[PDB]
Amino acid sequence: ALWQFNGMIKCKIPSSEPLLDFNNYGCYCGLGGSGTPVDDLDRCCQTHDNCYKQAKKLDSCKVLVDNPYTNNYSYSCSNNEITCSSENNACEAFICNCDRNAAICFSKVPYNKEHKNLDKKNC
């Protein structure tokens, strides 16, 4: 869900307030996402959006009537490393991996503040 994802982002980027820094960034970071990503951070968000699309197609998630946005997976953060819980079921695990991949991606790309709060006509 959002609470775990936000915690993962802070795990990798301890200086960030994700719900303020990454939301409404570029064409993909935040609600919806379409068009050409504007930079590598936006591509991280595009990948993440696509990972959620795939989670919704996974048989485990469908049978569990899962919503990736509300998934109740478990994770831990130690020394700025994210570990998705081994106890997560297949659906939970998939979504945890989407979130972990994105948090890692965000930590590895530049932040271009000219893309914060981008007008979606640019998308």
CB 39, CB 26: distance < 8 Å:
yes
Known catalytic residue: 99? yes
Is 30 marked within a binding site?
yes
State in angstroms the smallest separation of the CB of 87 from Ca ion.
Answer: 28
State in angstroms the smallest separation of the CB of 95 from Cl ion.
Answer: 16
Any contact of residue 81 with Cl ion (CB under 5 A)?
Answer: yes
Q: If you search the block for the tokens 């659906």, which residue do you land on?
A: 91
Task: Report how far residue 106's alpha carbon sits from residue 90's, in angstroms, rounded to the nearest whole number.
Answer: 24
Torsions phi, psi for 118 (to 5 deg): -75, 130
Any contact of residue 18 with Ca ion (CB under 5 A)?
Answer: no
HSE-CB for 59 with a 13 A CA cutoff: 0
Contacts 24+ apart (CB under 8 A), 15-18: none
State in angstroms the smallest separation of the CB of 82 from Cl ion.
Answer: 4
Residue closer to Ca ion (CB basis): 13 or 102: 102
Is 40 marked within a binding site?
no
The catalytic position among 42, 48, 66, 115 is 48
Residues near Cl ion (CB under 5 A) are 81-82
Active site members: 48, 99
